[PDB]
Amino acid sequence: GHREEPYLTEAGRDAFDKFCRLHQGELQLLAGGVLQAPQPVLVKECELVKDVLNVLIGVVSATFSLPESISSLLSEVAEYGT
């Protein structure tokens, strides 16, 4: 056996997140320092759920002060707690 070198559209959860930071770096190069969009990591899933459910109680957190599309998904429920 010598398998079919993971076709892209099926191989994710590491290779897609690697891949997100690749297209992010590409856009940053096409801008050239004038974009500089970091933090393509961090953290986990369940603790983020307890975090956002805590935001509904008014609570402050590590990312709530007072890929990369989770900021938009997070704003939709952040403005609920405000």
Partner: protein, 100 residues
């Protein structure tokens, strides 16, 4: 904390010169007021609270003490009763979610 003894002396004098026929109105002895016992307020791991899942279990048992009158290891009751809104001092280096 001591001006209450002045208050007790004034209300003592008021009832004393008012009701002049009976035997002397009852009093407590002074130590009942002077005890801190009767008022409800009076190896711990210096890791700087590293472990995130263990911080909840440590602070909640300090909470289980602080709900009923006892300063904790990480929470601590400030030495007022100057005022009446008795504030508490949590540990600085905590998870801010937990500290909040």
């Amino acid at each position: 904390l001591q001006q209450s003894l002045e208050l007790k002396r004034k209300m003592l004098r008021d009832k004393q010169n008012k009701k002049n026929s009976g035997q002397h109105l009852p009093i407590f002895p002074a130590w009942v007021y002077e005890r801190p016992a009767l008022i409800g307020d009076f190896t711990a791991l210096p890791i700087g609270t590293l472990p995130l899942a263990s911080q909840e279990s440590a602070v909640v048992e300090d909470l289980l003490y602080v709900l009923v009158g006892v300063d904790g290891r990480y929470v601590s009751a400030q030495p007022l009763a100057g005022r009446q809104s008795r504030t508490f001092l949590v540990d600085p280096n905590l998870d801010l979610s937990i500290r909040e």
